[PDB]
Ligand binder design. Structure first.
Ligand code: HEM
Ligand code: HEM
Ligand SMILES: Cc1cc(N)nc2cc(-c3ccc(OCc4cccnc4)c(CN)c3)ccc12
Ligand SMILES: Cc1cc(N)nc2cc(-c3ccc(OCc4cccnc4)c(CN)c3)ccc12
Ligand SMILES: Cc1cc(N)nc2cc(-c3ccc(OCc4cccnc4)c(CN)c3)ccc12
Ligand SMILES: C[C@H](O)[C@H](O)[C@H]1CNc2nc(N)[nH]c(=O)c2N1
Ligand SMILES: [Zn+2]
Lengths: 413, 408
């Protein structure tokens, strides 16, 4: 691979030079003859696999605290190696855990919000042993992160994988989501994105209220055991009713959303260790609610209704009635969150911050991996500064990774 | 190996076998993806490329290994021997030009690919001849508003010292004027080329919609200026179906998008002048040509006349104004019966085109970064469509601007 790679911004003419890509450790899925950059997704480590991965991480950590080659560095290497030698694994120090979690976010090429990466509150839950204990840790995370609407980014890290038969998992895809119910006539009540998980909860014993906005229970698996249901205390679930600064009729749609986006189905990888339960949360970009959650066809799909109540012609697509209604919904989402003092960021501000962040990372770190397909917002792409920004995508570790859905792999006791 | 691509909205899965036929590199590696980078002969090299292209041509008309195929191969072999190049048959020129479009991974309009009018201009020798061929192209393609896809192909490169080049980036573009007081009159995308035309003798009217002259280079000679006869330049006054004040902004645009600065490559031969034209997708005017920072940038004025709060970005005033500008463009073209497609219809057709290509061809190279429109991305069907990008030949390629190479 070439040692310097240049990326250009076609609006400002700024050219940046990337050297960090040389530290890339994982495959992208592309080859020299095919690019898979729009593909959504393109047994444990042996002793011998784990040694180099741990040394790589430990070296990186000691370089970061400006103690590379030191006595403490060499001692840590020796102590990790003895642990892997005698137990086939090792334990991270608290300092290393915190560093590893912050850098998995810093390295998340699909995240536009990384300007905040170093202000992450890390909760160490590696002493957890039961689903009830997982529920306690998750409730504390939700309350801290919500902070009465002044949201704070946070991650809670449960015990790492051992033999793969004792995994901790949150079966929910996010800690707070709304249920969806397939009706016998084919329609859906609630959130169509969550029909399958809702059905799993109902089999596991949940009594569904069967409304549009029913917070799903937590489904928590500790130490490889069968998962258990818990209702999040509703006073911990901050919600915002959606209204519009101009259209008085918008509140009559009866929409609301929850304040806290907390993804709970990803895997955190640090120094070859695998943390299969690591829920993390930030705050929303408005389009994540207003474009995707409401207007996606396999979601709430109320573009039609808003268009109708706006009395747009819906016969010609070239009237752009869909585009007009989409902007209005996203105006309402941003207005409702700001009015209730719940942290939210519009797509103009977020993308402007990410450009400043990318520039700083190129300056101080030698690069910033970024996935243009995900960084550019799902509406008004070209009037945001990331549209004209060239980006290089590559995979650094520590990292957040995808993992299979637990119901496809769980061995029922 | 076979590769699958999934639409996450319809859950339709397609299987790509066509990518196995590519031999040009994309710029990515196993460790770094350059999918958002804009730009990532000899007789010895020339025969295999010719052989590959002849083979796929005779495989396309289903006469692979025929008497005609065998003789054409030997014919091409002898011609590269004794002249270090070769000439395409007319049928091959048409085939290659249609397939360069079919293979253009960044083009959302490819459902039309086999309806392309191919003008053979390989007998041209002078810039005056180029002007005549280009006028004929513009008149044919414009067709009084019922636009028709066309390409005009000038002589291929020989030694690199005698290139034919159209210096304009499009056959029809408006001038841009760098003002003393900082800003820009006309089109800011074209400020540099406008100055190259003035430096060549062009008397600029210094208006806002000054059609640039053609600057035409034949056989490596210095380029010469020509004014396209104005009755050939179809234009559309931009007005808005509900905002009666919109017409008072004074805006218009031209009907015919004709890209003239790219290179067409067929069987190892390079055609450095090959203007090709279609019709517009509305966002190419209403989003990029009018609202980019380095373009007309009227966004601010439209939102003014709509009386939107512009103090905070979270009012999405930019987004509201962008939708209304694009409504006006589509309304204006359609009212004047000038061909134009909206980004919803165009992406719908592209998904249909992908389905056709996977069925009859085993795939369709597609560049999601370019296929997804510059506004309202996720409420169009291409947003949720996985795409594989790979390079097939014949193709359209980028080339350096001629003013950075040409020896005067
Ligand atoms: C602090 C405010 C944050 C904002 C505004 C934000 C914004 C976003 C957005 C808009 C996306 C893409 C969502 C979509 O595709 O619709 C994303 C993805 C992502 N975010 Fe952030 N994010 C934030 C915080 C965080 C934190 C705290 C973490 C981890 C500690 C994180 C890790 C990720 C990851 C891993 C992805 C990629 C998901 C995937 O690959 O499937 N983000 N973020
Ligand atoms: C017939 C109607 C057509 C439509 C609606 C259309 C639409 C588009 C659009 C919207 C783009 C992206 C432009 C941008 O946003 O910057 C594009 C790119 C492109 N189009 Fe088409 N197009 C059409 C016809 C054609 C024809 C006739 C040809 C060639 C014979 C062609 C070749 C290309 C190529 C090569 C590109 C990519 C340019 C690059 O790689 O830089 N298109 N098209
Ligand atoms: C902390 C945080 C804040 C925020 N403001 N936003 C966030 C969005 C994601 C995110 C977005 C889309 C995702 O989706 C991938 C996908 C979707 C459907 C099918 N396959 C794959 C996932 C993966 N859980 C996470 C993750 C974290 C976020
Ligand atoms: C036939 C046709 C119809 C249409 N309706 N639309 C079209 C748009 C393009 C096109 C768009 C963007 C481009 O830009 C790439 C670029 C710009 C500046 C510097 N490097 C690279 C180019 C290449 N000139 C062509 C080409 C052809 C088009
Ligand atoms: C990442 C990306 C995706 C996409 N889908 N499209 C993109 C279009 C441009 C772009 C490049 C050059 C442009 O202008 C020509 C130019 C010439 C010389 C110097 N700078 C600029 C314009 C203005 N239309 C847009 C840049 C990046 C793009
Ligand atoms: C097929 C396509 O890759 C897929 O729909 C992606 C595209 N880009 C995206 N970008 C973001 N931020 N979020 C998404 O869910 C997606 N979906
Ligand atoms: Zn790639």
């Amino acid at each position: 691979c070439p040692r310097f790679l240049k990326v250009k911004n076609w609006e400002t003419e700024v050219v940046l030079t990337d050297t960090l890509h040389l530290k890339s450790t994982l495959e992208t899925g592309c080859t020299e003859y095919i690019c898979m950059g729009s593909i959504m997704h393109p047994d444990v480590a042996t002793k011998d696999q784990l040694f180099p991965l741990a040394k790589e991480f430990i070296d990186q950590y000691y370089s970061s605290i400006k103690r590379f080659g030191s006595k403490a560095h060499m001692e840590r290497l020796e102590e990790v190696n003895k642990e892997i030698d005698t137990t086939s694994t090792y334990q991270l120090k608290d300092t290393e855990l915190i560093y590893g979690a912050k850098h998995a976010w810093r390295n998340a090429s699909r995240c536009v919000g990384r300007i905040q990466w170093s202000k992450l509150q890390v909760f160490d839950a590696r002493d957890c042993t039961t689903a009830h204990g997982m529920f306690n840790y998750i409730c504390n995370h939700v309350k801290y992160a919500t902070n009465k609407g002044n949201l704070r980014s946070a991650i809670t890290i449960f015990p790492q994988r051992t033999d793969g038969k004792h995994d901790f998992r949150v079966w929910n895809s996010q800690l707070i989501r709304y249920a969806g119910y397939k009706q016998p006539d084919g329609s859906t009540l609630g959130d169509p994105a969550n029909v399958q998980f809702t059905e799993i909860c109902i089999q596991q014993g949940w009594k569904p209220p069967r409304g549009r906005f029913d917070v799903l229970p937590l489904l928590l698996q500790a130490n490889g055991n069968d998962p258990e249901l818990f209702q999040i205390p509703p006073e911990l679930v901050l919600e915002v009713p959606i209204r519009h600064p101009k259209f008085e009729w918008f509140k009559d749609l009866g929409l609301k959303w929850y304040g806290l986006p907390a993804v709970s189905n990803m895997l955190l990888e640090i120094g070859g260790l695998e943390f299969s339960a690591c829920p993390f949360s930030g705050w929303y970009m408005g389009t994540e609610i207003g474009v995707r959650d409401y207007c996606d066809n396999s979601r709430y799909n109320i573009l039609e209704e808003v268009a109708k109540k706006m009395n747009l012609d819906m016969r010609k697509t070239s009237s752009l009635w869909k585009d007009q209604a989409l902007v209005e919904i996203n105006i309402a989402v941003l207005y409702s969150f700001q009015s209730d003092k719940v942290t939210i960021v519009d797509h103009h501000s977020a993308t402007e911050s990410f450009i400043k962040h990318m520039e700083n990372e190129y300056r101080c770190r030698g690069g910033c991996p970024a996935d243009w397909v995900w960084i550019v917002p799902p509406m008004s792409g070209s009037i945001t500064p990331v549209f004209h920004q060239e980006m290089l995508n590559y995979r650094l570790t520590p990292s957040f990774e995808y993992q299979p859905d637990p119901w496809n792999t769980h061995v029922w006791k």
